[PDB]
């Protein structure tokens, strides 16, 4: 289940994204609720620091912006 993919405290953000999209592609879900999973669930399950950073970015941030913003962790 996509809801069980949570970024570990040691894990780089790119690896967490990779697992999140791998599990996301097998999930049985509409494309809009997949958009909600990419846009909101991905941010909600990030580790504390990168989650703070991702929420600070506000709405509509692309995956490239999200990946660049968290590279300091």
């Amino acid at each position: 289940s996509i809801l069980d993919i949570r970024q570990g405290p040691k894990e780089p953000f790119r690896d967490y994204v990779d697992r999140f999209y791998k599990t996301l592609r097998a999930e049985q879900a509409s494309q809009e609720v997949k958009n909600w999973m990419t846009e909101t669930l991905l941010v909600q399950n990030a580790n504390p620091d990168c989650k703070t950073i991702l929420k600070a970015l506000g709405p509509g941030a692309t995956l490239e912006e999200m990946m660049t913003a968290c590279q300091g962790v």
Partner: nanobody, 113 residues
Framework: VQLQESGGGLVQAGGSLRLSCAAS????????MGWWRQAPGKEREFVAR???????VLADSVKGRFTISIDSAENTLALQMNRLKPEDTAVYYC????????WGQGTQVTVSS
């Protein structure tokens, strides 16, 4: 990492203001900075965003009127506000992204007669 906003104050409708966010250390090391605001009784709303290497993104309520810029010479983050409305009254916060997200304490912006 320390941040401090400034440039806020009291203005009439239709006026202009320029907020500035001072950062300790070098500002070019941050991977993202931006602006949020909070009005009395209302939840924090996103204002502006800058991600390193990317174009500025602005909220829809401000896109025509606000601009966000970064000055590496003074190590400061500027938000230029024009065509101000009373609904723009809020406390404005800058944020910076490094190993975590850091926030300033905010600066008050008040638009009124």
């Amino acid at each position: 990492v320390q941040l401090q906003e400034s440039g806020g104050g009291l203005v009439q409708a239709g006026g202009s203001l320029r907020l500035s966010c001072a950062a300790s250390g070098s500002i070019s090391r941050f991977n993202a900075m931006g602006w949020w605001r909070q009005a009395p009784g209302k939840e924090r709303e996103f204002v502006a965003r800058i991600v390193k290497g990317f174009d500025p993104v602005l909220a829809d309520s401000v896109k025509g009127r606000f601009t966000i810029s970064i000055d590496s010479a003074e190590n400061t983050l500027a938000l230029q506000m024009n065509r101000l409305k009373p609904e723009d009254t809020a406390v404005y916060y800058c944020f910076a992204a490094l190993d975590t997200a850091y926030w300033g304490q905010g600066t008050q912006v008040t638009v009124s007669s």
